[PDB]
Write a protein that binds this ligand. Structure first.
Ligand SMILES: [Mn+2]
Ligand SMILES: [Mn+2]
Ligand SMILES: [Mn+2]
Length: 430
DNA sequence: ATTATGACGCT
DNA sequence: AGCGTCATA
């Protein structure tokens, strides 16, 4: 009863850009706005690979990972923007720079954790306490939440989508006790008010729309964010969790979309997150290990303690290229040419990073894949990174991998290389 | 022949 | 240190 931790101590948001690389290209090229369109890398092989898709194009069934030639079969009028190519490879600089635009705006409101190129977690607990003090126990008006869904509402004793949103929001706000500054539901609501402001700032200052989730932890905030994309935000309260989880496939929860989630389903003979509540913590630990078991036990009750890490910048800067099928690198000079191309992009990004962020990478990680290997990476070796020079980095990379060559002929390379990856790691202040 | 990333956990 | 997992556009 009185000692059951409820995991309602924090207010956490997750902000995720809608169709992000597409919006970056649509801002640049107004002809692409409000159209079925997609972003593609390369073009020669089946029209290129799609990596982002506008919501107009999704309506035709176009998805990420689709070849553009195939997407065009579903959507003949699909418009395409190509990722820039530099030094023989796709170059993602435009999208990394657009990401920085958004992250810098979010950072004005609170400490953020950069979770991907297009999303960040926000810990809003302190900002909420401050805003609550400003509001002086005044009610929260629906006008302050013009794009917010309250998950699970409306409920109980209109056929339009926006009408339903407002009905649910009205029920929520009608119920709210605004007279205690410690009610978790109130805290989430004020959190949502701040996120409306954040999302308005992002759109005003960049042109980009986004969605967001507001809840008491990172996992629920991420889940919430996806519930009403695009261009909307969703509040998932502690109380909404039992109904939400009762039909929520386990794989939808962050970190359970892969092998672990599959094992939870198979070993326990269940389908939905809520079904986990019927196991003891020790039972879950017995199957999934101490850490995962404890995590699952709390998470299926809506509780998670993983903090929003204060980290706005990526921890690594990496460059990679696949050499699929016939193009696999079979000669030494081929290997060295591509190592140089990768190293040159890496030096460019590293030098920019050093100037912008007052830090230096100290370790170079070199990874390759060999033809036939099921795994994404066949081999990872590290060496010192002492100077930002592409020629040195590419020479050093070759040194740590050259013994992988099984060829008696040193001119030839065996087995052919299907992937090269260079990654600068272990930053230190400079 | 989705590709090009990035973070974290295990041993 | 090197490997594996899970996630992103
Ligand atoms: Mn997104
Ligand atoms: Mn995202
Ligand atoms: Mn996505």
């Amino acid at each position: 009863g009185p000692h059951m931790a409820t995991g309602q101590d924090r207010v956490v948001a997750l902000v995720d850009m809608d169709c992000f690389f597409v919006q970056v290209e649509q801002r640049q090229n107004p002809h692409l706005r409000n159209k079925p369109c997609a972003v593609v890398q390369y073009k020669s092989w089946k029209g290129g690979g799609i990596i982002a898709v506008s919501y107009e194009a999704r309506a035709f069934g176009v998805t990420r990972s689709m070849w553009a030639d195939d997407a065009k079969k579903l959507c003949p009028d699909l418009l395409l923007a190509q990722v820039r190519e530099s030094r023989g490879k796709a170059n993602l600089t435009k999208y990394r720079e657009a990401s920085v635009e958004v992250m810098e705006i979010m950072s004005r409101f609170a400490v953020i954790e950069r979770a991907s190129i297009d999303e960040a977690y926000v810990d809003l607990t302190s900002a909420v306490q401050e805003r609550l003090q400003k509001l002086q126990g005044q009610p929260i008006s629906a006008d302050l939440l013009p794009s917010t869904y309250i998950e699970g509402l409306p409920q109980g004793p209109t056929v339009q989508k926006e009408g339903m949103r407002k009905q649910g929001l009205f029920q929520w706000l009608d119920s709210l006790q605004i007279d205690n500054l410690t009610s978790p539901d109130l805290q989430l609501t004020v959190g949502a008010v701040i996120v409306e402001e954040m999302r308005a700032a992002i759109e005003r200052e960049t042109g980009f729309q986004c969605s967001a989730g507001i809840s008491h932890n990172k996992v629920l905030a991420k889940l919430a964010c996806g519930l009403n994309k695009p261009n909307r935000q969703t509040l998932v309260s502690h109380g909404s969790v039992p109904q939400l989880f009762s039909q929520m496939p386990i794989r939808k929860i962050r970190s359970l979309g892969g092998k672990l989630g599959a094992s939870v389903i198979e070993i326990l003979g269940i389908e939905y997150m809520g079904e986990l509540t019927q196991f003891t913590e020790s039972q879950l630990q017995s199957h999934f290990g101490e850490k995962n078991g404890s995590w699952l036990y709390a998470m299926c009750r809506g509780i998670e303690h993983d903090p929003v890490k204060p980290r706005q910048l990526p921890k690594t800067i990496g460059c990679s290229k696949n050499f699929p099928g016939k193009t696999a690198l079979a000669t030494r000079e081929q290997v060295q040419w591509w190592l140089l191309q990768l190293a040159q992009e890496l030096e460019e990004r590293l030098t920019k990073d050093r100037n912008d962020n007052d830090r230096v990478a100290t370790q170079l990680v070199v990874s390759i894949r060999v033809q036939g290997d099921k795994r994404l990476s066949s081999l990872r070796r590290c060496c010192a990174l002492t100077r930002y020079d592409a020629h040195k980095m590419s020479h050093d990379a070759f040194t740590v991998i050259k013994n992988c060559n099984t060829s008696g002929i040193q001119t030839e390379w065996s087995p052919p290389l299907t992937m090269l990856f260079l990654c600068a790691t272990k930053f230190s202040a400079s």
